[PDB]
Amino acid sequence: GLGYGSWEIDPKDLTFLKELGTGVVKYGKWRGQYDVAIKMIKEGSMSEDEFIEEAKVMMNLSHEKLVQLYGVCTKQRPIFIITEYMANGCLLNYLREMRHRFQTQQLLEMCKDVCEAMEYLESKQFLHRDLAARNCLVNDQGVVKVSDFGLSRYVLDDEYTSSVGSKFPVRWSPPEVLMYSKFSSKSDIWAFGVLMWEIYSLGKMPYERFTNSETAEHIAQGLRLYRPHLASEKVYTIMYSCWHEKADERPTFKILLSNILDVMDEE
Numbered sequence: 001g002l003g004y005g006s007w008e009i010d011p012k013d014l015t016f017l018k019e020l021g022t023g024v025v026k027y028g029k030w031r032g033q034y035d036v037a038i039k040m041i042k043e044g045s046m047s048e049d050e051f052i053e054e055a056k057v058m059m060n061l062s063h064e065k066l067v068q069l070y071g072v073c074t075k076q077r078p079i080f081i082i083t084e085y086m087a088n089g090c091l092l093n094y095l096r097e098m099r100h101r102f103q104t105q106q107l108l109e110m111c112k113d114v115c116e117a118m119e120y121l122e123s124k125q126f127l128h129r130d131l132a133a134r135n136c137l138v139n140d141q142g143v144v145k146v147s148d149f150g151l152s153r154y155v156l157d158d159e160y161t162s163s164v165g166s167k168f169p170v171r172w173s174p175p176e177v178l179m180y181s182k183f184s185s186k187s188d189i190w191a192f193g194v195l196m197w198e199i200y201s202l203g204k205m206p207y208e209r210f211t212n213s214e215t216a217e218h219i220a221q222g223l224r225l226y227r228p229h230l231a232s233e234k235v236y237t238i239m240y241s242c243w244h245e246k247a248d249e250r251p252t253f254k255i256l257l258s259n260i261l262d263v264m265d266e267e
């Protein structure tokens, strides 16, 4: 209504129902009826004007395997990001809960969910820039969706923002990122291969016995993760294809999707 742009949600339309943890995220309703998650952005943590402009672009991204951004509440502090509600939370935690007793068919479907979202982002020339299990969410039906897409661009804490930083995603980064800060579609591809490894490893940390420094050296020497016990040879071939030293030899998300579908048919 009056005073709200298409990207702006009126926070008075929100009903807060549950604390989901930590900025802080809550579960609630929008206009009484619709489930939403509300993420409250810690003051000083984000380049807010830049994020708000990008939120307009992100509003136009729509795919069933991508967490939907509904809008932002910006007339205020902290600002809110309003999204689709994902009842089963973070993929990384979901994987680590051994009660689920996942079949490998379920693990491959999680990979396909993510790959479909990434094929969609690739088709829109939109890089994720921090793809990892910790940045995927799981709904009440067990469907995995990609979250936080592109958001690293607006983080102000310099520990997060380059390889010099102590909170940079070294373990999800190809050699050309670690060496040269060369981001591309192919750095998302590399990260996707690591995500498949996380899925088939039930949420182990990649290179779990190494520091970030040691990981960077391992990768730069041409060495890699190796096959999770739950990955078949064909699944391992797919994740490993994401880790070619030469970025241009790595597949596209379309090719990965075709490979995943082929393995689902065969296994």
Ligand SMILES: CC(C)(/C=C(\C#N)C(=O)N1CCC[C@@H](n2nc(-c3ccc(Oc4ccccc4)cc3F)c3c(N)ncnc32)C1)N1CCN(C2COC2)CC1
Residues within 6 Å of the ligand: 020, 021, 022, 025, 026, 037, 038, 039, 067, 068, 069, 081, 083, 084, 085, 086, 087, 088, 089, 090, 093, 137, 147, 148, 149, 151
């Ligand atoms: C504390 C606890 C119980 C929780 C978790 C673990 N893990 C856990 O799932 N979290 C963290 C808190 C928050 C949660 N979260 N975040 C979101 C969200 C993400 C992104 C987002 O902005 C976007 C921006 C751009 C584009 C797209 C989205 C908005 C969100 F609202 C969300 C959403 N949309 N729906 C549902 N949940 C949601 C995930 N954990 C921590 C881990 N613990 C383990 C360690 O011992 C057990 C168990 C309990």
